[PDB]
Design a protein around this ligand. Structure first.
Ligand code: G2P
Ligand code: G2P
Ligand code: GTP
Ligand code: GTP
Ligand code: MG
Ligand code: MG
Lengths: 432, 429, 131, 429, 432
């Protein structure tokens, strides 16, 4: 009934999608061929036979990444029409994604979304996976969101976004792409979950004892967070939360819609024993800064909203107790305009474990979604990066060559300045 | 003969409701199929208070289940006793309320309300003499709070001469279950003050405390908490459903407990609570029960009765017991704890006794206290509301649904006035 | 800049309960009769203001607090002030707010040492600070 | 009818307490489960003096168990008869007192005291007519001494018209069980002098001597020692719990034994004590018992009654015996030992006779002596206190807990005054 | 309930720890894998399964000694996070331990302590094992204690310390390390138990008929003493003593917190028969100077406090008798300000014997903790040693090179002078 449609944009979005849909299949007992020998149904539609099909669209402007899906283990899982590819990529250029190349497939993508949505009886909304840095993840995603907003007025849209690192980048033009896409998508997105590759790598190294974590590992970790967020819809629970509640709880002001995700416990097989892993223990782990998935310092910021999503063998009283003690602690400060900081969800289903996965099997897990004024720091950094390059007009010729105007750059930058200012204003405590 | 209509709104409302029905069914000897398998004529005498008799000798709860989302409903249906309910009495939406009072009261709830009302009217018409209504819900969410209040408004308009009772789960003091709960509670209270005849305030914090400290349960489940609430609920109608020595009912209790129309917010209590080990080491007698009833640790609202005064107390006893003893106990508490009872309402303890005890126990007691201490709860909510509203935090979620600042302001002011009123009577001589 | 102090085992460096309470009374111009009344946090907040001009948002402090959560709120304000001044001693808030004698007495003995380390002799009228 | 409340503080207090309960239970025909399996109406007649009757025909000790550490409590629970106690009457801390009177009286003890008081009040309210209280503890430790005294203070304040009795284990003369015991004893005595109505002084040194020399036990255990104490304790309430020829009770004994308020420190004795082999070679008759009672080797306090004078003696006999004989014996001891009895209190022997003897024996006797010789004990403690205090040894352990020199000084002075008082009356004509 | 957390610092601390935890496991029936087919619980926490984990932290600045634990018989007993190692040691330099090298892991160590302590419901305090002579045992331990004192205000802290011998040393800079660490730790420790390798060796040779005792033997002996001290907490007893009582009884003045441990009987298999080993006999053995574990002469000093901890088949009356007779004897003199000298504990559990151990199985044992003015002699000796080297500034360049200041040396020395003076003052009897 309560359907959720998943959209995977560009390389990051697609590869994360692969990891998500692998996990979903294991959780619902769906084979890679779509067969199983009302729960799954929010994510999978059903044909006449026992075949089940993901309520998903995978889009990329080049064929390579999706071609892997086509030839891979889950080739029979997806319908061919839900795997959409162009010929040439956006070449790390927002302009190409948003305009030159993106305008050729946007209609197609939207048409397929419309067909998907037509077979939903109680569409809850959209889960959009992409990156900030790529030309497709930035430019195409922005375009897509805009169209979605118009075609579907008020339905929950949630973006899981690969936010670029402070000092661990791949592309050179990343800051440009990040800034423009944030500007263009801002008024069209309800809530966007930032996650950083650096942080996840650190977690893998420090908590899981992995010398060299691969992108796969990161993807797997991300899939856990997503599963926590959607478990309330895919399973039964004691105390439940849906997609339209998160936006209400986590977003205090329209522009300030960037919470951050943190998962606990992430442990190895040998380290999983030796320690009982209580609600108190995992909750504490959540609010410790080293286990966060964005390279930022909450100790230097303030909390505006916390949402805690518990899963498995969990007792409400215990959760209450845990939260109370965390409320006391000096390292957790909340803004003065927010006496109530917590929304709490508890679901009965333990986190399910992928065969050959890095994580140990636990009785309990928790996913925290927290909105923090500390994110301002990252924005400030990104703006500074933009400034350095733009002052010299470095790379600008490319963007203009693809039909973008220089004035739009300045526009994006000023909007981000305003956003920065808005966070700071929010930060300050009430007089009288 | 005095038929009662039961309504359940939202997740909390429905989960409590189911528990309550499980309790009532066991009490009246009704199985999960609707068939009577009891062993006493007393179990069927007043069966019509809560059950309609259907064809082929089965009984169906006079219950309406309402929610803007279909998951809780499904769970209830799949639960033990889920099959006893009338299928057409489940009235559910598809969207949900997003923890938003506005959605429950003005938007999604409003799209569903007429369908509920239709069922309600039918139920009313079924009954020869409608006693009134009991609504179970939370004040902190969107459905139970916003839609529940809407239901209350409409039902009251339709049936202004019947009594409107609510069992309201209130936001706790120390920890908040949701971020917008002050808004949701504040708005709901505004409606409740004008449209309900009596409101039982129940707080999960209190319940957990009771479970841990009194019941000695290391690991309580929500079920346990629900059970307590159900026990209280059953307690309030016991005199209406079985014979007694001094018979009370819903109207009488309201009359005794409510000296002024706005002051209809109670704090319930239940006795006796004991652990598994500790039960044999005591004796369950009237005085013991009385003492258990009159303390702060056994109140299901997170407020200390010692921080205010009792305006009135209703005590309802179930089991074979001596009325003299009860009276003596009641006098004794008044005399010894004189400072906790308002001096301008003499003999402000009301007693009821019903001969049929609950199952497993030889005697029990239910306490209804109308204390000026409840003002603390309201005050806290007002404070929390103010802190958020002064910065207009989350306001666009509600204004987006057509709501205006003025409505909020009026609601706040009304709440403040109520607090003032309560303060007034505690100090009055 | 604020220094940090430790209390474990000393001789002739401990005020009696009576003397310590007198000091609090004289310093803040209040009339506490039990050390556990300091668990509300208002007094500690006021002391911080007196030690370090600025420091604490006293308009937020509840001087007539009677409920556990109100006390917690005062201690959050205190905690923030400690963070601002770089005092690294962890305040055991959960134990203090229960109003337990032992913990409160422990905290006041630390606080007195901290105060003595940092007090510059300034005079102020604490009534204005209070209200 | 004259109900007594029992309190046990610290390791010693609890271990004696358990033994006492084992004795009382056997006497009244109560098993480790709380069920009556006796064979006489006399066993149940006055059962309410020490037991509350719970539901389903079981009996529960009116006993409160208090300690700052949880090990002794656990042991008691696991002991034979551990299951008879009310689970909610065990009131324990987590920290311990570190052998420190300060911790017991002002700090850890103070954190726990209210919880104890709550139980105590409830127990008091249970009883139709509260006779008073008996507290078992040591003076040398931290809990029994510091917390025990605190309890005494508070209870007395609450219930100033009821009698406060203590069974105090005093530090021995030759060897010290702990290093700070003089401080702990001295402080405790200060409280006891002002707040108790009667105090039975018991010393382990005496007990060991009795075990070795009189009972011929090569290898006594602490259990054996405890047994003796329990026998004495039971002896003092025997006339209150069974019928007799001349019935005494706690009040009467206090009245007889205490001519001035401060001089309420007794030395108990019990008769008859015999070995396994030596029992058959004697005859247990009244004169024999009397002679056993009146000697130095059978006193449970380490002081020679021949070093002072008896102010008063109470003798309590249990069994079927001729009152004339008893009277003759009493007269005889006074006449022959004239120099050991103060001359300005004529006929300073008080006699009680209870018809029910203890189990296994056909007759027995309990002796309560108020002798000016007890001043020796106090003097020793004062000396030891002084020797340490003059160099301020260990003082930082107590000052660290908020205590001041002044308190110590005052305590010392008070103790000295008491000694002086005792000296005065021994020499008075 | 009454948890005790054990910290093992540097080589000595770690190796003693190995010996302690071996014994604990045998005493509670815990296998080397943590499995057993409320008593143990003060020393071992319990996971969901039947696994039990030591409430312990092992720390060393080099990996070698802890690596043995990792690869050894009890590898599965400890959680990996409780075995903490750096890369480079303190090189017998207090400075490196306290500052240069120690400041890199102190935060880590403390964090793990905090996590351990969080899962305690009734923490009694800390047992700290180290040496005076090593750079880690001296410098790191001092640092650690300081942090512990601040983070945890008033909880019992007990140090079992390998005090250096008069004429049987290993390191050359031992006196420096000993002096500085004693200075720095003094105000932060509640009671510290000195033990000397020379004395234990002598005992092994003389009482156990061992030609060549190894460090292992010494460690085993030490483990007995520790077991006696903690048996009152780990088992039931007749008359019981806890960690917070020892400090009260054994410490008459704040600075004078150095008692000494003595154990009886220490006998071989063949010598264990032929003699009944009564309470009187073992008590006498305790107070005879040859069986003491510090190379010092009590006959030339005065007793300030004795604590006697008996264990096994022991009768209170008998103990009382034994003590009384010892009180009479000329060779036992007590200070004049102390009429009561004895605290006595009796526990029901006999000393448990390690398979392949040097000690014979006895029905009764006793551990005496005695505070004696005779320790002043050792201090005087150590100060003299410091003086000889410092007058020439021998080795000083190393310490200063690691950031220490020369003024701190003089400071440490003067503090020790004062301590010496304080003992002497205490020694003298009261006038009038
Ligand atoms: N006593 C209970 N309280 C509940 C239960 N479920 C939720 N709640 C409480 O109610 C509040 C959250 O409200 P809901 O789940 O009812 C919101 P809904 O839109 O479904 O109406 C909050 O205080 C929860 O802690 C329950 O089963 N029992
Ligand atoms: N007659 C007995 N005396 C005891 C017993 N246990 C301890 N004691 C004596 O009491 C004194 C030590 O006191 P405690 O064990 O009671 C200190 P606590 O803080 O637990 O109170 C000392 O004289 C011991 O020798 C016992 O079981 N029987
Ligand atoms: N977490 C994660 N991040 C990825 C993965 N693949 C790429 N990224 C990140 O995504 C960003 C690069 O963007 P891509 O998604 O590869 O580029 P694109 O969206 O395909 O855009 P074009 O290739 O330019 O059309 C960088 O920050 C990468 O670190 C992945 O599998 N997992
Ligand atoms: N009793 C005993 N003493 C030991 C043992 N190992 C070393 N020692 C003593 O400890 C002192 C040497 O200190 P260590 O602990 O080895 O040095 P450390 O603490 O590791 O410091 P660095 O190696 O300099 O970082 C000497 O007095 C040794 O005799 C042991 O297993 N048992
Ligand atoms: Mg790409
Ligand atoms: Mg080393």
């Amino acid at each position: 009934m309560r359907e959720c449609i998943s959209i995977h944009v560009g390389q990051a979005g697609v590869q994360i999608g692969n990891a998500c849909w692998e996990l979903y299949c294991l959780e619902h007992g769906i084979q890679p061929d779509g067969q199983m020998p009302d729960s799954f149904n929010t994510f999978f539609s059903e044909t006449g036979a026992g075949k089940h099909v993901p309520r998903a669209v995978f889009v990329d402007l080049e064929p390579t990444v999706i071609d892997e899906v086509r030839t891979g283990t889950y080739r029979q899982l997806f319908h061919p029409e839900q795997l959409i590819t162009g010929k040439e990529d956006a070449a790390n250029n927002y302009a190409r994604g948003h305009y030159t190349i993106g305008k050729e497939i946007i209609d197609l993508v939207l048409d397929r979304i419309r067909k998907l949505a037509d077979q939903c009886t109680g569409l809850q909304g959209f889960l959009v996976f992409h990156s900030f840095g790529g030309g497709t993840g930035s430019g195409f995603t922005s375009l897509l969101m805009e169209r979605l907003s118009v075609d579907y007025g008020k339905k929950s849209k949630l973006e899981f976004s690969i936010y670029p690192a402070p000092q661990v980048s791949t592309a050179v033009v990343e800051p440009y792409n990040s800034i423009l896409t944030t500007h263009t998508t801002l008024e069209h997105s309800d809530c966007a979950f930032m996650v950083d590759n650096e942080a996840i790598y650190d977690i893998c190294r420090r908590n899981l004892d992995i010398e060299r974590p691969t992108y796969t590992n990161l993807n797997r970790l991300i899939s856990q967070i997503v599963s926590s967020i959607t478990a309330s819809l895919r399973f039964d629970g004691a105390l439940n939360v849906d997609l339209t509640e998160f936006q209400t709880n986590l977003v205090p002001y329209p522009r300030i819609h960037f919470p951050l995700a943190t998962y606990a416990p992430v442990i190895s097989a040998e380290k999983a024993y030796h320690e009982q892993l209580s609600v108190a223990e995992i909750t504490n782990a959540c609010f410790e800064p080293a286990n966060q998935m964005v390279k930022c310092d909450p100790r230097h910021g303030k909390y505006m909203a916390c949402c805690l999503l518990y899963r498995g063998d969990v007792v409400p009283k215990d959760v209450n107790a845990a939260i109370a003690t965390i409320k006391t602690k000096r390292s957790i400060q909340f803004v003065d305009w927010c006496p109530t900081g917590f929304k709490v969800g508890i679901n009965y289903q333990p986190p399910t474990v992928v065969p050959g996965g890095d994580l140990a099997k636990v009785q309990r897990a928790v996913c925290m979604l927290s909105n923090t004024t500390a994110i301002a720091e990252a924005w400030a950094r990104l703006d500074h990066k933009f400034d350095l390059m733009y002052a010299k007009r470095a790379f600008v010729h490319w963007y203009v060559g693809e039909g973008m105007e220089e004035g739009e750059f300045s526009e994006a930058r000023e909007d981000m300045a305003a956003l920065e200012k808005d966070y700071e204003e929010v930060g300050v405590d009430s007089v009288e | 003969m005095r038929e009662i209509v039961h309504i359940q709104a939202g997740q909390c409302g429905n989960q409590i409701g189911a528990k309550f029905w499980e309790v009532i069914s066991d009490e009246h000897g009704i199985d999960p199929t609707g068939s009577y398998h009891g062993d006493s004529d007393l179990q069927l005498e007043r069966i019509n208070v809560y059950y309609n008799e259907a064809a082929g000798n089965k009984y169906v709860p006079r219950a309406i289940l309402v929610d803007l989302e279909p998951g809780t409903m499904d769970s209830v249906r799949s639960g033990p006793f889920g099959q006893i309910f009338r299928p057409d009495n489940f009235v559910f939406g598809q969207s949900g309320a997003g923890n938003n009072w506005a959605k429950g009261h003005y938007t999604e709830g409003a799209e569903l309300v007429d369908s509920v009302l239709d069922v309600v009217r039918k139920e009313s018409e079924s009954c020869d003499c409608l006693q009134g209504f009991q609504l179970t819900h939370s004040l902190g969410g969107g459905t139970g709070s916003g839609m529940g209040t809407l239901l209350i408004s409409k039902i009251r308009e339709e049936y202004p001469d019947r009594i409107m009772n609510t069992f309201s789960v209130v936001p706790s003091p120390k920890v908040s279950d949701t971020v917008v709960e002050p808004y949701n509670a504040t708005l709901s209270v505004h409606q409740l003050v004008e449209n309900t005849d009596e409101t039982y305030c129940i707080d999960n914090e209190a319940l957990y405390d009771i479970c841990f400290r009194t019941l000695k349960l290391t690991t309580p489940t929500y079920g346990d908490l629900n059970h307590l609430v159900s026990a209280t609920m059953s307690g309030v109608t016991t005199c209406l459903r079985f014979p007694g020595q001094l018979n009370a009912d819903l109207r009488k209790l309201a009359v005794n407990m409510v000296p002024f129309p706005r002051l209809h917010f109670f704090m319930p209590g239940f006795a006796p609570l004991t652990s598994r080990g500790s039960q044999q080491y005591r004796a369950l007698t009237v005085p013991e029960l009385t003492q258990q009833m009159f303390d702060a640790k056994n109140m299901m609202a997170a407020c200390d009765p010692r921080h205010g005064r009792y305006l009135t107390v209703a005590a309802v006893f179930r089991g074979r017991m001596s009325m003299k003893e009860v009276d003596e106990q009641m006098l004794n508490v008044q005399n010894k704890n004189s400072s906790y009872f308002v001096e301008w309402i003499p003999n402000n303890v009301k007693t009821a006794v019903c001969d049929i005890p609950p199952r497993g126990l030889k005697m029990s007691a239910t306490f209804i206290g109308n204390s000026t201490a409840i003002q603390e709860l309201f005050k806290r909510i007002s404070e929390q509301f103010t802190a958020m509203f002064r910065r207009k935090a989350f306001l666009h979620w509600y204004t987006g649904e057509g709501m205006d600042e003025m409505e909020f302001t009026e609601a706040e002011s009304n709440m403040n006035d109520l607090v003032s009123e309560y303060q007034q009577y505690q100090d009055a001589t | 800049m604020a220094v940090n102090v430790y209390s474990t085992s000393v001789t002739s460096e401990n005020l009696s309960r009576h003397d310590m309470l007198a000091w609090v009374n004289d310093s803040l111009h209040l009339n506490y009769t039990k050390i556990e009344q300091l668990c509300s946090g208002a007094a500690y907040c006021q002391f911080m203001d007196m030690l370090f001009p600025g420091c604490v948002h006293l308009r937020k402090v509840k001087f007539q607090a009677k409920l556990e959560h109100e006390y917690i709120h005062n201690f959050k304000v205190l905690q923030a002030a400690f963070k601002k001044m770089g005092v690294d001693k962890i305040i055991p808030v959960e134990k203090l707010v229960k109003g337990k004698f032992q913990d409160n007495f422990e905290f006041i003995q630390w606080f007195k040492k901290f105060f003595d380390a940092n007090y510059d002799g300034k005079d102020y009228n604490p009534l204005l600070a209070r209200q």
